[PDB]
Amino acid sequence: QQIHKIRITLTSTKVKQLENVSANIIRNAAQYNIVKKGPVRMPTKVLKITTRKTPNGEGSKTWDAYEMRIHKRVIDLQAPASTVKRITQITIEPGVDVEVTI
Amino acid sequence: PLVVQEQGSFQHILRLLNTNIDGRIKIMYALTKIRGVGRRYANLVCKKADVELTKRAGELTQEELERIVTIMQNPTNYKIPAWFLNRQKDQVDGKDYHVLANNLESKLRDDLERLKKIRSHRGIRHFWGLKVRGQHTKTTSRGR
């Protein structure tokens, strides 16, 4: 449980906090002499829901088109597991959730 | 594989199973005039009888004509699949059959009274001449 190629997967709805955490981790992986791979921009997923405007069934056939973009980024680090987890607490953000896989 | 000629051997009108067949139609599609014989069925009896499909009806000799009517009357004896047959798992004797020109409407009729005699729902609507398989009749089938 020393050095470890560790993958961190980042998913969120908003890109500013995703890129701030991504850049902050990359920045912290720079002053610490840790070789890094990323961030990798995964193809964004557009969750689309198209309903009818009318609560009843009358009028011109008009539709709403709601959207929910999901952006996913993975960053590869070469560091021991204790080091990577404390970086996550440094760059904790309410919007972005974090999962760590070895 | 070339144009060939013949004289006096062509037969303009054939009579098979008491049905008149035009002799200048290709054999695979000429036999479809016989009721109970579709395009799919005519393709196989010609191939089981070693009658190449490139021949018109009148081109055939008597030996081939009897060989075809023999196969149609005895399909299972010539490796014709059961699922390929017209009337399989027959109602009365339970064997696989293929009814033909002067027999199809007889057993189709016998099926109708067999439906009407038991007074099934399907048999009643057949008597009225309406659709029996649940089709809507509100807005379709208004001719006479």
Binding site: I49, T51, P55, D64, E67, M68 | -
Partner: protein
């Protein structure tokens, strides 16, 4: 006796097998992404859930 008859008919894989989260309706349900919400309840909660109109 009665307990074996009351509410005995199966209520799975049907439209009555599910209901709206909000109004417990059976018609116009949305099952995409496991929403399980009526189309009318979705509109009044879409902004809260995170669905916005862009195009």
């Amino acid at each position: 006796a009665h307990e074996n008859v009351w509410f005995s008919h199966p209520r799975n894989f049907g439209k009555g097998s599910r209901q709206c989260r909000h109004c417990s309706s059976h018609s116009g349900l949305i099952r995409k992404y496991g929403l399980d919400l009526c189309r009318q309840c979705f509109r009044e909660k879409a902004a809260d859930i995170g669905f916005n109109k862009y195009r």
